[PDB]
Design a protein around this nucleic acid. Sequence first.
RNA 1: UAUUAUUUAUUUUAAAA
Lengths: 259, 118, 290, 232, 213, 232, 239, 215, 221
Amino acid sequence: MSLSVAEKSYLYDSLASTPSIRPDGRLPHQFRPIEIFTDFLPSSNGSSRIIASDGSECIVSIKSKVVDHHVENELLQVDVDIAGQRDDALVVETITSLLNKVLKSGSGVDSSKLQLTKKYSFKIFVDVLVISSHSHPVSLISFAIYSALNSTYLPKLISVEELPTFHDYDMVKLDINPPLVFILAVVGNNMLLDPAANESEVANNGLIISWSNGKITSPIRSVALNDSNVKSFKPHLLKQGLAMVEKYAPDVVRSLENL
Amino acid sequence: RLSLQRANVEILAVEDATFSVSSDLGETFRGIIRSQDVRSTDRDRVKVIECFKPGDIVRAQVLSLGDGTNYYLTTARNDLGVVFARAANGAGGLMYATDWQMMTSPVTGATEKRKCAK
Amino acid sequence: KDIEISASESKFILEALRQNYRLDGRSFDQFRDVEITFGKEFGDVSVKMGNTKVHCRISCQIAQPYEDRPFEGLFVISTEISPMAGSQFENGNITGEDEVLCSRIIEKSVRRSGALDVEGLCIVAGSKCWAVRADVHFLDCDGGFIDASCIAVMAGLMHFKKPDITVHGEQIIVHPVNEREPVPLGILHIPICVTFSFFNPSEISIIDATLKEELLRDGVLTVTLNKNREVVQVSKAGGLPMDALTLMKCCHEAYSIIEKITDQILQLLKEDSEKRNKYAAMLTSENARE
Amino acid sequence: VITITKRNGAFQNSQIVTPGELVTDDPIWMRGHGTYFLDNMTYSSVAGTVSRVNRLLSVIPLKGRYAPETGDHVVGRIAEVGNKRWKVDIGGKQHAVLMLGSVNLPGGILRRKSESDELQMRSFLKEGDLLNAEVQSLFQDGSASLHTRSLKYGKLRNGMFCQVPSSLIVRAKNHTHNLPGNITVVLGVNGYIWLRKTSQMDLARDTPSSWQIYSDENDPSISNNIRQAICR
Amino acid sequence: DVAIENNTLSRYADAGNIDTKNNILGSNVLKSGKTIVITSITGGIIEETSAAIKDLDDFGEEELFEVTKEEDIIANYASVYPVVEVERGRVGACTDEEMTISQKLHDSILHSRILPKKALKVKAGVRSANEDGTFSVLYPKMKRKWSYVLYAKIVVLSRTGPVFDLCWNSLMYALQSVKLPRAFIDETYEIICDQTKSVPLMINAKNIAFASN
Amino acid sequence: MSTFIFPGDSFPVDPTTPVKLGPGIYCDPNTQEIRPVNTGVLHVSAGVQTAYIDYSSKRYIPSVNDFVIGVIIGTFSDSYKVSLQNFSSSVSLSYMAFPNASKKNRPTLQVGDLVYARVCTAEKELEAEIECFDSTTGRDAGFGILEDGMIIDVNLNFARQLLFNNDFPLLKVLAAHTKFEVAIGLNGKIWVKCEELSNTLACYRTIMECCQKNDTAAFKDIAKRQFKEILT
Amino acid sequence: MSRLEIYSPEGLRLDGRRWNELRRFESSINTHPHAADGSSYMEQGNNKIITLVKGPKEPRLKSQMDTSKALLNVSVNITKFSKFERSKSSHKNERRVLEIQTSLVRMFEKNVMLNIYPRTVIDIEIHVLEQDGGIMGSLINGITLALIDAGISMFDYISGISVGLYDTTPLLDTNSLEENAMSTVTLGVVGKSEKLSLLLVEDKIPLDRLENVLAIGIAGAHRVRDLMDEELRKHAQKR
Amino acid sequence: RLLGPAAAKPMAFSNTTTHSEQELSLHTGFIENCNGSALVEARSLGHQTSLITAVYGPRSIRGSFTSQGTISIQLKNGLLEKYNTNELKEVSSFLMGIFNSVVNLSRYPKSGIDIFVYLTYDKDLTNNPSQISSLIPHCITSITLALADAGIELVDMAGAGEANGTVVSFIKNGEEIVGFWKDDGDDEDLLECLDRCKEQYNRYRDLMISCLMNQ
Amino acid sequence: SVQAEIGILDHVDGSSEFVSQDTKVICSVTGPIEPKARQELPTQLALEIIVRPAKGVATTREKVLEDKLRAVLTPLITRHCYPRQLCQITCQILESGEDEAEFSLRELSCCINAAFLALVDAGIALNSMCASIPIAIIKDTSDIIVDPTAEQLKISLSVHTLALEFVNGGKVVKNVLLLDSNGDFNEDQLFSLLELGEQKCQELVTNIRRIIQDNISPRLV
RNA sequence: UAUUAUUUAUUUUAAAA
């Protein structure tokens, strides 16, 4: 739902206080309960479904294609499709352009782990289907592509240059370090991790931070969360948010790589 | 646009006699001249077809913001009304104001009733 | 921007149906008299059935086949409707329900059901093939849009002729239409559509409803048969729920119509072929001995 | 820390009647909701339990939105400012209508002529505002007609909004209650709840006009312990 | 009054420092009054097949072709495929103005006989792999044939009236400043254009025209 | 004096004699010359000398003192919304434009009802207005709802010839076969009604066929063959 | 796979079933409670469909409001990964979707009592996660089960079943491989009756063979209604 | 006609056939269609950039009842170095999140402002083989120029700079950050990125006022 | 000699069919009718011009064909006596009668003649009459020919479309509505064909006046 | 100010006297 200007000023004064009074009252580093299903699409090499606390849901499918990397530039393509939105929408093309940067072959994802012959390699097709969304889902999708890439199985290669052949039954597991994306909301001088729906509506600005190989990696953004209260932030808040994810990201990876 | 009880107009200028006026610019305002605000003598029960025509230039003082979408204008003054019109909805000659509710073109000689301003 | 039907007009037409009366004077199982007219160029056909008038235009060009079927030719069809057939149609409304359903039914009847010999349209496998296109122009709308359009396309495909091709090793040369006479397409069977309109005051079904009857309709059914007693395609979605007995009666009644219409197209094509081949008796090369 | 429930392998983890089946063949009945009449017999249109009250035969479906009735202390949000009325989001099948002659106007009546009726309403009751009112009457389609003709109903502020299913609202004499910790709850029968700090009116009226209620200005100083109480 | 700047955006702007990752074969920046016209010309290459009856090696079919063939004067000339983009502060698809100007430029270039088809032929080469001279290209009947395809994009800024005359005059300047990159094949073998060597487009100055309303 | 004329032709009337402008001729607001704009037969009547052109047309243009058959397409607070012809602009029918009207009583007319009215206002820059009783003469007989029956589409020249010219044998040849009641609208509409539907159906088919066959002498054979066919 | 036997003399098909045996039918209700008013996860064979019903609600714009009934909008989203080969979006592939969506709207607008819900709209959002033949029939089953979950009043069930005809032997619930080798008929049977609300024949079938195919089609569709009905009984008694 | 023959292929150039200071030039006010114009050009090392920005506003939105204004920024390809349409709209949403914190939105009720940036020429002269990061600072300076020329209220000037794919936009003489963009780059580096961009921001902050006070 | 029919279509106000050589164009006119919000003109009549090709979809080629056909019919219609109204003029090209990829004058000329006849059948207020002919000059023998065949177009140096405006019995050429010329020509050839065209259009309206009179006269009384 | 209103009408309670 929307929010009235009366309760908007109520949340701003309570969140910006030195004791951050969250709506649900969690800590600025606590996340909401998440349900993640994996391995349910037989036709796909990997699949996952994630259900957020506010009813948000996202489905990821992973297909593969044998391609010559000498002629195929990007070996990892992300195709996002938000329900109720057009394919040429701005809210879709931005996340599509952003997810292809966190999962860029040779950057956030090393192209060596999906190579085959000297001539050929595997191309990963990550298709995203956002069934329901209440806030910016770039962080919820990153969790879904994480659990899907860590459960993906690609056909095993059987090996003068000739076209490659694969075994009939046996398949190898795709071992790739999948980057993670976090959303941070600044409300005055307080930094919040995983902002809710109503929380992201009164925030002064937002932060997007990637995380791969146990460290902060490119890209990172500072996109707004609502056109109403867009406020410039002190550089110490950027450092505080960039340092807060370093303190709690391993707690996420440990709680996310268990599958 | 002429309705039975209102006359939709398009604001082209405004006072700053000096004024201010701006094509593909996309910047234009519009108002509504209600029948109750056409004249001061006998406000109710008038005929806007005999006071305005589509394409006529009207000098009118604003009353207030109508419904956000349109403004509310009035012409219940001697200096407010049609200030530049043409015969047969622009298909004739340049008419000029004469009486308080009569407008005529010199060359063609045709007369048409308006709500003039003089 | 739509058609207004008065309450008295709706009641009169329905009550007339309850008394076995159609305003035009046809029976409930009577198809409108179809009239095929051929233009100058091949593949130019104008169909008139009642006040409904439709004009078709066949064309072809070299195209890339589908990688799933490198040995078949393509078939394209567009059934856009202009305000010419009635101001209720908006120009540029290509995704309308009438436009989509008309294209899909003729596409299934021609391409999918093997009416057009797509394998004969293969030039070079996986590279060169004929893409036979069918353009349909709705001239005057008095109902029976897809019924008239299916007769126009099927008459145009049998009247259309493609440029000739000679196979010379690995080379292939397309003769200009001015040198060699073009070659006709391969038409296996001739599917003809028949649309049924249903009403309820014990239901009444009429064949090939006019525009006025089409607006007071409670349910529509489209069947497509050929003279080979084959059910090419059937489309029924919603409206009055019907059972298998009512459908089979519609199919048997439609077969009596599509069989006569088939013989007419074959006869009207033969008459048009002789009109434009007056001196064809002198130019015969393969002749009998003695 | 995060609690991530993980699953692998699959996609996920009285009389009952279904739509289309026969509930009774007795013509002497009064068909209610979830029930349709056909050929002197009675069939079900939804999936639920059969209800019998006197002669009213109906089927209560499982899942269902809020059905507004006459005299309901509801909490709704303003959707749009329409011609001589408001569209308030109650949570039913349709938006409920709040007529102009059914609220406590600021200056008593409209100050005209100057602006239209609709533009003058947005000055104190814009889109998205949250308030509470009572369903005065119902339309033929089931739409609710609200009214704010008392000091008890007004524009909500100084609190936070939460939503629960409408079926989980136990009926009681009082709609709003005072809670320990200087907090007041507004249990709307439509499922909309408004948790706010106890005000001067609800504390002094439940225990034993002007545009001051249409003001969006929150309370200046709220205790930090009171706001954290609303979260719990 | 008009002011133009040719080859300003072109790949061959500097004869000494020819750009590597440039694509424009020739450009022109025109400004008449307050309207601004920017016109660049990229290009591609297409392989043409020999569908002629001469390859049948039959005298009868060839004689029948020569008798029945009718003269087609404009068939020996090609045209450019322009893309007009008049910036008027709007969003959406192509305006009726942009589409009409593109069609007029195509129809006038074709009828005025600016680009004959023989003037867009590709003198095909074969680059060799001699010993440690890495590569070497040679230029001259060959089997495979090619033809140049010219694409033009026009961006009109600060439009104050009819701009078709300005788009045409800006295109006639850019056409008189394009160079066709020489092409060659290696020794699955697609064609490659030269990195620096190029030949200017032989446009007959007899047929070039200018616009005025 | 009747002659065929074309647009742009010279008007065969001297500018000395004052001539009244009718439908077909146009007075240029600039050059003040009288010139034709339509294609048809020119008519000039030798006190007042009027001139007009009789052109073939099917799109009805509202003109005052015209009897039309309209279809109600919209009910409102104080007026109906009537359509005189498809795709055309709708006309206005006020609730006070009825015999024995009252502001406290809404007329019993719904959408889809056929009304026989009179055009009382036809301003080019405004919406046309109709009424179901003559505001000038007080007439009311014949105006109002056309219950049941069937409406027919004809060109404007066929409808005008049927209402005005008493020599048009269509009405006479129809009475020779069946008794009926007819209402002719100048907007190309003809409403007929008989006791039995079979008679009304034959009247519909005859008026349809007689409209396209301009041979007036063939109306007798049309009704003879049409009424004889429905007997089968 | 490869060259297979469609209907062996031993009465066994290529996937092991028999002529009158359906694929496995696992339906689910209320799978998306916090994202729609009606939810149904349809899993018929390898077909995986998510059907979401959002309504009846106020229309976002008054341009789509009916003062006498509700508006029914069916949106079918066929994912890029529904098949083996990840299909790329084609301009021709959009026409087939519109025909399916229109056929579904016209089908359920006659069975759903839209008069009870005036001035409202009912959005049906469908996501096909995997398809393996008989996709049209499975789409019908998902809509019927999702509308019931949303409490939308209907006259009866609408069961979707697909029947194929191989030589002279009809086969129930055709999969993808069988549709590629025979003619296919999809049916929309209303409840336990023998009345059809949908009949799509997209391939050639002899007229003398169509009578029997419909009989076996409406029969097997009654079995589909039982499987859907039983799922609603178990979900209502356990809650 | 348009598009041309589908069988034609674009030209291919082979790499084996034959072989501190960042210049700036600013202009404003030259498009009659819009209210405020701008033209920024920069040529450093083997990469030349030249783009044009036009501002059409404020435009009164019919029937709108918003309290503050709405900014619409749209990037559009030009004639050289064409980027994908997805990444262009990504920079557009990043730019809109910047100017919504700079442009006085409360001073424009029931109206919107439409920005049009045309990347007319993005030359690159590298010897032998995200590239969009080198244009974000130049686009921010171009919009602020055209927004100031259009008489639109802007709370302080806005500029940015690049530091190996790291783009940071400052305000109040670098006191507060209004935008953050970083593609590729390395790790640990952050203090030197904010420093190299801040000195580049002050270089652009005063050069924009130079051409704005002359002419 | 040319063929033309009137009132062929039922569900429109006015229709026509014009034939020349092999070019066939069917045109329909409906108006005055209710215009769209983006179409209405406050003082005069709005036109909706639509021409559709015989093959394929409507491309940008027919867009400039609409713009030229619009420039001819707009001064030919008394737009001011239909304020806030719409007129839908739709031309359907049945056969092109020429090489569509090379020439489009034989279709433009027929659309003008078909639209004018359809406007007469509809009853729209026309300020005058109109005639249109295609003109070409042959390469070898620079001879001006009126209404050239399809083969003569492929052997021509320049092609021309002349649309004139006739008043007073079809004898006084009031103005030159449209003269569209493409190819190679100089000032002497222009006035040579312009003078030749003025007398070929003059006998066209004389034949058009006879065509429409043979149809409208049996309708009226 | 719903026995109020919307004009090419988004009113969805116009019934009683």
